[PDB]
Amino acid sequence: KLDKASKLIDEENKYYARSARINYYNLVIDHAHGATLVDVDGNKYIDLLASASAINVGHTHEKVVKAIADQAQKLIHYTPAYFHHVPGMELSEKLAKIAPGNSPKMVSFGNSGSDANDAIIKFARAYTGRQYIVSYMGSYHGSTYGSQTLSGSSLNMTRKIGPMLPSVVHVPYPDSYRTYPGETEHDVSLRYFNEFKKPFESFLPADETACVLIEPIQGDGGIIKAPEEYMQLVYKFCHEHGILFAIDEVNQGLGRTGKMWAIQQFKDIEPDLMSVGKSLASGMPLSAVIGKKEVMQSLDAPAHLFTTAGNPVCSAASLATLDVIEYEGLVEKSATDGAYAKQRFLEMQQRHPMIGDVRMWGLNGGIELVKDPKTKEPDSDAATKVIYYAFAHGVVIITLAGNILRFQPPLVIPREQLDQALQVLDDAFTAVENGEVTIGKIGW
Amino acid sequence: MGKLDKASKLIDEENKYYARSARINYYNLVIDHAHGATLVDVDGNKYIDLLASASAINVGHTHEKVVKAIADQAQKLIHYTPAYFHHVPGMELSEKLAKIAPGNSPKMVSFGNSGSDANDAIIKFARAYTGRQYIVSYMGSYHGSTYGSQTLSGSSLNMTRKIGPMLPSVVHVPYPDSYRTYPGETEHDVSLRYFNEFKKPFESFLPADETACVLIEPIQGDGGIIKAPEEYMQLVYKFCHEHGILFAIDEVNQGLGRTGKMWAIQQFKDIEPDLMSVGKSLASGMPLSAVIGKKEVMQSLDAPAHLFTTAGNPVCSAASLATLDVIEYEGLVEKSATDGAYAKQRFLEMQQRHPMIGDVRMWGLNGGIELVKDPKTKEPDSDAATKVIYYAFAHGVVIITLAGNILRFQPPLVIPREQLDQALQVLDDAFTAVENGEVTIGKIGW
Amino acid sequence: KLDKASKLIDEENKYYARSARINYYNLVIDHAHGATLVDVDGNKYIDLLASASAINVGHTHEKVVKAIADQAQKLIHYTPAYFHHVPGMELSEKLAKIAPGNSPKMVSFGNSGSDANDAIIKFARAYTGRQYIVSYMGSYHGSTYGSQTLSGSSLNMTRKIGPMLPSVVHVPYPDSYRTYPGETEHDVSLRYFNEFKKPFESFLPADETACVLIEPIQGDGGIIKAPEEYMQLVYKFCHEHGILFAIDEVNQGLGRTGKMWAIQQFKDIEPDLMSVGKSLASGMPLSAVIGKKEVMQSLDAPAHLFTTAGNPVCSAASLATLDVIEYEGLVEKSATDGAYAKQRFLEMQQRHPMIGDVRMWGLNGGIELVKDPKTKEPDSDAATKVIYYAFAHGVVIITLAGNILRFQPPLVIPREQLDQALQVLDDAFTAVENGEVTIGKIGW
Amino acid sequence: MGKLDKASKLIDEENKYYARSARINYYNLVIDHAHGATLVDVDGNKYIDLLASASAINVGHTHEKVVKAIADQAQKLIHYTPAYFHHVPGMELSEKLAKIAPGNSPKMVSFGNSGSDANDAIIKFARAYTGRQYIVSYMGSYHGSTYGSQTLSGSSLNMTRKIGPMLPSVVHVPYPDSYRTYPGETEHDVSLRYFNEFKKPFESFLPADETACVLIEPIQGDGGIIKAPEEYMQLVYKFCHEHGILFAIDEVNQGLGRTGKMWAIQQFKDIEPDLMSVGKSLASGMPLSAVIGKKEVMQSLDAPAHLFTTAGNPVCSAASLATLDVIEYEGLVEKSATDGAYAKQRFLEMQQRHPMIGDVRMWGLNGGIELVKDPKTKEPDSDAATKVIYYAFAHGVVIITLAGNILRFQPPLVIPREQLDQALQVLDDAFTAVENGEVTIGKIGW
Numbered sequence A, C: 001k002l003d004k005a006s007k008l009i010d011e012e013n014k015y016y017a018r019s020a021r022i023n024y025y026n027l028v029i030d031h032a033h034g035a036t037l038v039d040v041d042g043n044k045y046i047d048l049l050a051s052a053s054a055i056n057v058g059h060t061h062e063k064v065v066k067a068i069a070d071q072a073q074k075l076i077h078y079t080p081a082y083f084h085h086v087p088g089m090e091l092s093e094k095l096a097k098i099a100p101g102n103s104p105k106m107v108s109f110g111n112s113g114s115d116a117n118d119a120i121i122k123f124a125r126a127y128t129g130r131q132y133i134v135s136y137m138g139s140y141h142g143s144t145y146g147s148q149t150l151s152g153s154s155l156n157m158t159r160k161i162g163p164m165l166p167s168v169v170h171v172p173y174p175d176s177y178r179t180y181p182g183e184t185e186h187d188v189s190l191r192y193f194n195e196f197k198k199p200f201e202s203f204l205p206a207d208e209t210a211c212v213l214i215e216p217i218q219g220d221g222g223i224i225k226a227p228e229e230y231m232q233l234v235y236k237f238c239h240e241h242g243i244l245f246a247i248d249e250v251n252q253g254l255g256r257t258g259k260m261w262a263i264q265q266f267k268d269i270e271p272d273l274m275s276v277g278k279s280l281a282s283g284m285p286l287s288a289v290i291g292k293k294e295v296m297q298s299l300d301a302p303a304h305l306f307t308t309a310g311n312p313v314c315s316a317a318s319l320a321t322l323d324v325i326e327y328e329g330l331v332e333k334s335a336t337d338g339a340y341a342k343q344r345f346l347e348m349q350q351r352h353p354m355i356g357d358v359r360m361w362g363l364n365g366g367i368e369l370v371k372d373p374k375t376k377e378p379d380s381d382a383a384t385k386v387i388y389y390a391f392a393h394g395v396v397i398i399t400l401a402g403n404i405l406r407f408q409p410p411l412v413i414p415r416e417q418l419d420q421a422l423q424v425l426d427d428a429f430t431a432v433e434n435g436e437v438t439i440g441k442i443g444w
Numbered sequence B, D: 001m002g003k004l005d006k007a008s009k010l011i012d013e014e015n016k017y018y019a020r021s022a023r024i025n026y027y028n029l030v031i032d033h034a035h036g037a038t039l040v041d042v043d044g045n046k047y048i049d050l051l052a053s054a055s056a057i058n059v060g061h062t063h064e065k066v067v068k069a070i071a072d073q074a075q076k077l078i079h080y081t082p083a084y085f086h087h088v089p090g091m092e093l094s095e096k097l098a099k100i101a102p103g104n105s106p107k108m109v110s111f112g113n114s115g116s117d118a119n120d121a122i123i124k125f126a127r128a129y130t131g132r133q134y135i136v137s138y139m140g141s142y143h144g145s146t147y148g149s150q151t152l153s154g155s156s157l158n159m160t161r162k163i164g165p166m167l168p169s170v171v172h173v174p175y176p177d178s179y180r181t182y183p184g185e186t187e188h189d190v191s192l193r194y195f196n197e198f199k200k201p202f203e204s205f206l207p208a209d210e211t212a213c214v215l216i217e218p219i220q221g222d223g224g225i226i227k228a229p230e231e232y233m234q235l236v237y238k239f240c241h242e243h244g245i246l247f248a249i250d251e252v253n254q255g256l257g258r259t260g261k262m263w264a265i266q267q268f269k270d271i272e273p274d275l276m277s278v279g280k281s282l283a284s285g286m287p288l289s290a291v292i293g294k295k296e297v298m299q300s301l302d303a304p305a306h307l308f309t310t311a312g313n314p315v316c317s318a319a320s321l322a323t324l325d326v327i328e329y330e331g332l333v334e335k336s337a338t339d340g341a342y343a344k345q346r347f348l349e350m351q352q353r354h355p356m357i358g359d360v361r362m363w364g365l366n367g368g369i370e371l372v373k374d375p376k377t378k379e380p381d382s383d384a385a386t387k388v389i390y391y392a393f394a395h396g397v398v399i400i401t402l403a404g405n406i407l408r409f410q411p412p413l414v415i416p417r418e419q420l421d422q423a424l425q426v427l428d429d430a431f432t433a434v435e436n437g438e439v440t441i442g443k444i445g446w
């Protein structure tokens, strides 16, 4: 069934470095539309990954395809780093405006979420005149040297490549699942905030910290959301010490959580700096750092620019992509379908006790599998068999951190397919319970 | 004059929203559409392109094979990240790049989006393969704007100011200047002198045996189209291999036929890099890059040490396959060599008549025409180069400057001889015009 | 009483940088002996600080004075960095032998605890081929760029001097007083070991960590001892991952804790690397890093040396200093006088509820002062009052961390004097409770 | 032969316990006692000290006033830390040092234990005062063995190997070499060439406006007794003062009369430092050091940014007070100046008869005699230098080498003319004896 796919992968493994791919299964995609992937052997699948939340508006949206094709006929590329073009001008202004909050904003383009997160460091340091950056354990911010240092989701992002960027301090992110007996959401918030302050009470001067960077919901961490009160404490801590408050919206923005921006899951928080990428241009490489105007004015050329950033085709694909999110009401749909999928997985959890935790905000969720509900011991083996059963039954899903099923379908996903995919996962759970699935390095 | 009104207005609006640090400004050129070496602005004016979007447009604007590849690919799959799964344009391209890279040792590839991220990877791969931390790169260099690649760079102080500390364990060395030499020095003197400067850190505080790699532009772009002497490069290459130091090259600006060979390092005798970076022209300006390295080196890391969600995007992969096909079947490597020897002669003739031209440097349709206040002092004359680019722009030619006083000559490799001759004549005219004070002219350039 | 002191201090202030002294009171010491200090105004005091535990054998001990005098007549200095002298030869050998545990050891001399801690970093990195160093929040390791990066007890050891040494990670030290309601010592041990592991489970590879450096009892932190269990877990974690286990015995060695080395308060822990200073030469500038032999052979000259380290006068003084420790049995005497002083402090806590915590291990202690025994809000104002009283009644004592009284008198302090000092401290509490004490920057 | 038995046994026992990286080895000299310029070993052999414990014994070994200050202070108080409290000998010295420092601008002082830690303080104070991060130091320099000062250094690869990453944001520049020059170069050509190298990092990746200080040895010690030319120093001093860069000097080795002025920076016209490190001879080899800077620089930090338990030890402080009085009362500064000019002639005369002497450098009783295999190639001759110090040791003279091939001449400043001439005759004989192959030889030296 995967004869061609397997032959092409075996060839690719001779020429394409293994560090450039987290492998799960032999899926070679030929074409796709909406939430449907078709492989080179003719197998069809429903996509519950959306190329890691880059395909929020669905694969090959008619509108995005046309913008791409039309723009490519006029100009494939002229660098905004030297000169200008219209899609770029129009996009940079539109992004300045749809970013959360009311303060005047400016924008700088990149190619990837990585480089936008490097930008956040640059802009925070330059505006504050301070050097230290605080970021979170469990985070993923990119694979360039700045954003990679801020990250804490894989040891292979640190092994053999150091020394890393200096003056970076990692603090732990609130885990509302593996908690101490009898802890409320209040306790968790306060205990993690207390851990947050320890470096500041010892070796890290708050008056020399340029900024704090946070995923309002951690993606690669395992779809973990900060509690409301935790986040308001951090936010407040930052404004009281003149530390910029920065958000990474690259994974969780553009409607993934059922609001436009995942920071809007929290009350009245306007970031000083934010990174955007992934779904921005429907998987075409474009990113943006968007900060308050006075922060963005603290650097002079050429501190931060890329030859191919704000590519006019990418830009056109992005304008059409933002229009699909508005015109098809994808933010609201994500909230709705997400509430629905939440209820469906909680019901499955009544019948499959390998499901320890159901986290979901919009059509973005982490379904954490454990060996026993009270030890909460991770059971990656179970998760791997679930995704293997899924793949063999027309559903593409992967894991985070070994034992968490990752749920991030295109937001356009028809209800019919959503229900088919959910039924396969229910079936998978039963199969794995029954010993009916068996199995190099898989996943994180 | 009264011909740039729409452009001026759109720019004044853009500047309210788009950070000033994101653009090196020259003139009010807003491109509407383009083809070949011809740009058409939003005001309907037409220009001959002598920049090729900073060497990203080697096959010319909107090549119909590249357009075609983009549109057809987009119809099937806009994206699926090769960081998790696979697609055919990316598989075919990675393989092809491993084979067409310089030399015969087997290679592997890792994709990025930018020349910046590929140079970050060179750091990664070198350190992991060698187990050593120090990186040596050059004064005058440009490697990118991510923290690794930006630290390696040495072409603008605005790439260091207010954003440090930068990446540790990097050392800069001077790049050979063959124009501003000491009186009497030969090419051999220059080579030896700059090799002696290369060795000074290694003879004091920098252990050769803890140095992972030396990264070098075979010809420096942002530095001002400066080529290392043959013998210099041989000594550095030799030194690297006597010490277990990887020899790495940046072919982002000067690869893919720009110098009149496929790769800039092929201007030198029998140098095979361990690691190289590619970008820019790779996919005709679509965002795609690669680090190409020897197979053992590229095997030194495990995932996810280096990957990006949108790197090796299939639309960009398809555009790149089409771009590399065009380069071969249109013979762009050879055309760049032939037209370049021709451009060099035309500029040397111009230098006989216009004493402000201190140095003509050209390898392929890749040149730096360095302007100076006096042939003997060689004092840079930025003001004159700024004047020449303003004159050129006003007569339908788009050209910019490097390091203040150097005219950057990098037109698409497809440039028709008709247009190349029109553009060279306009520059000839510009020199005369500037001599006679006809041209007038906040921060322009580097 | 302090006419001459103040005129002298006033002049010094014009010429000696204020960063170079943590200020408490106008004490200008003219001479001393044992535990008795006499100022230039002829006032007399009892020494409860021992020059930050640098004078364990008491001031101007007759045998150390003689060593100094006699050596200075033969050779004031010849640098062992180029050549050799006998007092240095003899001391290095003796130090290699009296270090804890029985693995063969070698030694390098420095001038300060600070530089011995820089050496720990060098030797750990060199022996392991790894770069990362873990140290603790609340730690104090020194004032040279390496040791100072590792430290975690004053924001003024980081402010304005960065960037600091890279590849250093700080972890939380187990606080056995401000705990969560219900916690045993077992819970504390495991909670703080769980914090220890978090960086190694996110961004810090255990296999690239060269060493963990720990004060067995933290001094500048407030005389905080690590629980036995937490320490066995860290100790084990390092052996399992090839991380070197290193201890700082600069403040807490040489009998301060009632055993020879503070690490001997724990069961069967032989360190890979250790720093020594302070009391080693009676406050004469001398330090050593002592490591397992194979660790110390990982470097070639001149990786770690100083012109004036292992100065022969300093080495003579140290040899004599060590002999007094043995022949006056100060190790035993510290343990006895400390169990005694502990009960005297527990007694005072009965009558003075402002005493929230009594921590004592040998004649080494911290007496923590609070505003309430349940809130445990620190009362810095109280502790400043207590020490200002003590001073005005012939007792030299200082505060750690604002609110913690520091009890570290020379180990040879006579029982008569100890009781004299303790009674002044008793009077001090009552006087402060009755508002009978009134009082820029003081202490930490 | 048969004279070194006790020494050999002792060193052989020492090597089992004392780490090999703590000593640069030359020969089996184990000192029992010394006085003035006379060392006596444990075997009862006698020698003339031409090293002064690396310029730490300027006033001679066991000077009676220094020995007396040590004894007398020890009976009153061996230590009370100035980091917490005060004592009279530290107070007096802190003030004398602020006053005897070069230039008229008011100064403050902070005490350390070692020249290393004083250079670490230079880094901190410079960063703190300017609010800038970058430090510029020299290739060939030695500043110390603590992470800050060690990162500044550039005289041995074993100061960087296996212990990095080092301190970030440090840049090394080359120190002017007036011996191995290009044909025809005057001292003006050297000064300008080395300044042009100084400027290259500031013209590429290092913003002058983000550079906190330059740290320079006025005469390099471990680099081989190399003195910057006057004009090179003026250009650096100038450049610093035009950009808000602190100008900092290390006087640890070359201070306190060694050069035949009180401070080596006084060999230059009208240069006052912002910061200087002092150590070594300060307290006659007892562990004491100071950072001395302009008042306002020293006020840029709050406690405890820079302090040490045993810094400003009262015993070391009294030794230092006595040491400085001896320097003044015995006219040691002028004596180094006079005996220096005399020693220079002598060596210059030896050069005529022994052509292996390639270069004679001398400023005070402070010289490097550089041995080469040929006058025109200037190829280092380590072998010859090592043979000379072995001849020398055998005939009652203790001298060592710098950089392989450079004889280090740094006797106590109080050395009597008869001993000086005794030791100079031995060296004259050494040369001739090595020319005849009469001398035989782990790693020796640097």
Ligand SMILES: CC[C@H](C)[C@@H](NCc1c(COP(=O)(O)O)cnc(C)c1O)C(=O)O
Residues within 6 Å of the ligand: A052, A053, A111, A112, A113, A114, A115, A117, A140, A141, A142, A143, A215, A219, A220, A248, A249, A250, A251, A252, A277, A278, B081, B083, B084, B304, B307, B308, B309, B310
């Ligand atoms: C290829 C997918 C990546 C391994 C990872 N996402 C990348 C990411 C990034 C980096 O984005 P790129 O540089 O575009 O990959 C930045 N911020 C967050 C919150 C991210 O999740 C993920 O979603 O698994």
Ligand SMILES: CC[C@H](C)[C@@H](NCc1c(COP(=O)(O)O)cnc(C)c1O)C(=O)O
Residues within 6 Å of the ligand: A079, A081, A082, A302, A305, A306, A307, A308, B054, B055, B113, B114, B115, B116, B117, B142, B143, B144, B145, B217, B221, B222, B250, B251, B252, B253, B254, B279, B280
């Ligand atoms: C926008 C253009 C850029 C400022 C500059 N070239 C970028 C470049 C880069 C960086 O490539 P990107 O990250 O794709 O901009 C890497 N290596 C070399 C040799 C380069 O020249 C240039 O050609 O001027």
Ligand SMILES: CC[C@H](C)[C@@H](NCc1c(COP(=O)(O)O)cnc(C)c1O)C(=O)O
Residues within 6 Å of the ligand: C052, C053, C111, C112, C113, C114, C115, C140, C141, C142, C143, C215, C219, C220, C248, C250, C251, C252, C277, C278, D081, D083, D084, D304, D307, D308, D309, D310
């Ligand atoms: C001046 C005294 C110091 C501020 C401080 N102790 C210095 C110290 C040091 C540094 O020793 P020095 O470099 O000799 O000051 C190293 N390790 C520990 C555990 C230390 O406590 C103290 O005990 O308060």
Ligand SMILES: CC[C@H](C)[C@@H](NCc1c(COP(=O)(O)O)cnc(C)c1O)C(=O)O
Residues within 6 Å of the ligand: C079, C081, C082, C302, C305, C306, C307, C308, D054, D055, D113, D114, D115, D116, D117, D142, D143, D144, D145, D217, D221, D222, D250, D252, D253, D254, D279, D280
């Ligand atoms: C032990 C002798 C040392 C290897 C070396 N000098 C130490 C030194 C130092 C360091 O002094 P300490 O840290 O006291 O050794 C600082 N600055 C200069 C210019 C120095 O020369 C020397 O003079 O050979």
